[PDB]
Structure 1
Amino acid sequence: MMITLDHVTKQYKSSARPALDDINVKIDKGEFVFLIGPSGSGKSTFMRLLLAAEVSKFHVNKLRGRHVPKLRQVIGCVFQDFRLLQQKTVYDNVAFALEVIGKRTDAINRVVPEVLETVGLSGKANRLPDELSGGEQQRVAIARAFVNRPLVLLADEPTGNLDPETSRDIMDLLERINRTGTTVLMATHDHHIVDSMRQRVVELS
């Protein structure tokens, strides 16, 4: 019930359009939400305001340089260009984010072999670390967000540029992650989403 924005309106770079209007939505723990797709608008707007704008122990009003990094560790994000480099191996590419927080040297490796099979990567983990196909990019992108134990993760347009028969499995794997104790927020301008969970939502633009 802490994840709730009420009467919050902002515009993209002070545009004349209202952009993100006063949309009142309340998200409880493990409450799946998609994007209603307001005529296919700019989905970078009204999605990136949950952190570093212009969610558990702090609201969206207490802003400071020592307040953003602590509450930025309880939230993850999934992007579109996957932010995966060919200059570092895939087994350690997911492990890059661990030392940014800072843990022990042996503490890094005690969690990788129980998180790299949740999305499924044991068949493709070390060989071909540079020449990596586009199929496992989304798998390593999702696994980058699960190295911690976040509450909410942002996943905007994760279908990429590929056929839907190999895109439905991402939603299929993300469906069984929701009842583990985390909240998944979805953001895509695609149809046949209402036939997945069959729950009535609101329509605000």
Structure 2
Amino acid sequence: SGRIELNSVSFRYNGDYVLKDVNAEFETGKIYVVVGKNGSGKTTLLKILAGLLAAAGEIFLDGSPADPFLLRKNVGYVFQNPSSQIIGATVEEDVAFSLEIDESEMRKRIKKVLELVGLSGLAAADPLNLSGGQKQRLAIASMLARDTRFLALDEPVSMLDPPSQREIFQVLESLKNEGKGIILVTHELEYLDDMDFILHISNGTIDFCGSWEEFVEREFDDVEIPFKWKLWKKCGKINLWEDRYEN
């Protein structure tokens, strides 16, 4: 178990702050969805969480302080563009890569994450020549293999079709039940089954953080509200899904 704690955290790339005094706690077992317009600071926040960026302020991993090198050691990260974490002549070499630091085990933890993301049978293929969706699947796999307490995903299924998006999220949800912290940045929210929290980022600060209901209520304009939920509150249970099969 565990709990990341951002206290008075702010970040600059070079110019002005892209994060301005952020305060949050991310606790194992719950799932956090992060939303906000382009250039709000979602990815920067996430990289500061996975120890990929050193930020100003205090960050605690389980009471004690944490430098980036400790944070990395305990949060797996998935890039918006999977290609920047893909390396290896073949797929198993790719998954194997951050099992860098045994050969026995380090081969079906592999094909476990591969069957999990739906990539079984391509483990002997040049990662470079996978399809876009399959490259994303790959990145998810390699991060999952790490077996970190926290999973920081930066729009992981942004190029899978909604059935695939839905299934991947179900995998994540399962992993939430097994006591893994999950922080998820997305622009769709459509495929999201359930969530413990939604954070909204405006311009470096966390504007909102609560239930989904509270979110659809406050009315944000930068974030697309799922047609499914709009259709839930009016009409109610119309049992639309029958149309998918209609006997």
Q: Which of the five TM-score ranges fits, normalised by the shorter chain?
A: 0.7 to 0.9
Cα distance per residue 1:146-185 (max 9 Å; x no partner):
2232011221122334544443333232222211221111
Q: CA 1:173/1:24 → structure 2, altered by over 3 Å: closer, same or farther? A: same
Q: Measure how far apart 1:88 and its partner are.
A: 0.8
Q: Describe how 1:24-103 pairs up with structure 2 within 5 A.
A: 24-37=23-36, 41-50=40-49, 51=51, 52-54=53-55, 55-56=61-62, 58-60=64-66, 63=67, 68-83=68-83, 84-85=86-87, 88-99=89-100, 101=101
Q: Which residue of 1 aligns with 2:110?
A: 112
Measured in 2, the distance between the counterparts of 1:160 and 1:132 equals 16
Measured in 1, the distance between the counterparts of 2:65 and 2:141 equals 27
TM-score by length of 2: 0.63
Q: Which residue of 1 aligns with 2:14?
A: 13
Q: Which residue of 1 aligns with 2:173?
A: 175
Q: Secondary structure at the match of 1:53?
A: coil
Q: Which has more helix, going by share of residues?
A: 2
Q: Secondary structure at the match of 1:176?
A: helix
Residue 197 of structure 1 is aligned with which of 194, 198, 213? 194
Q: Measure how far apart 1:25 and its partner are.
A: 2.1
Q: Describe how 1:150-161 pairs up with structure 2 within 5 A.
A: 150-161=148-159
Q: Which has more strand, going by share of residues?
A: 2
Q: CA 1:43/1:107 → structure 2, altered by over 3 Å: closer, same or farther? A: same
1:188 aligns with 2:186: yes
- Indicate conservation of the 8 Å contact 2:32/2:196, yes or no: no
Q: Which residue of 1 aligns with 2:130?
A: 132
- RMSD of aligned Cα (Å): 3.1
- Larger radius of gyration, structure 1 or 2? 2
Measured in 2, the distance between the counterparts of 1:166 and 1:110 equals 23
Measured in 1, the distance between the counterparts of 2:144 and 2:199 equals 29
Measured in 2, the distance between the counterparts of 1:8 and 1:154 equals 17
- The one-letter code matched in structure 2 to 1:137 is K
Cα distance per residue 1:53-75 (max 9 Å; x no partner):
13247424xx4xxxx44542222
Q: Which residue of 1 aligns with 2:233?
A: none
Q: CA 1:107/1:129 → structure 2, altered by over 3 Å: closer, same or farther? A: same
Gaps in structure 1 of 5+ consecutive residues = none
Q: Which has the higher contact order (CA 8 A, sep 6+)?
A: 1
Measured in 2, the distance between the counterparts of 1:202 and 1:120 equals 29
- Indicate conservation of the 8 Å contact 2:19/2:45, yes or no: yes
- Indicate conservation of the 8 Å contact 2:79/2:156, yes or no: yes
Please say which of residues 70-79 and 156-165 is displaced more in the overlay: 156-165
Q: Percent identity?
A: 33
Measured in 2, the distance between the counterparts of 1:199 and 1:88 equals 39
Measured in 2, the distance between the counterparts of 1:35 and 1:153 equals 13
- Length, aligned pairs only: 192
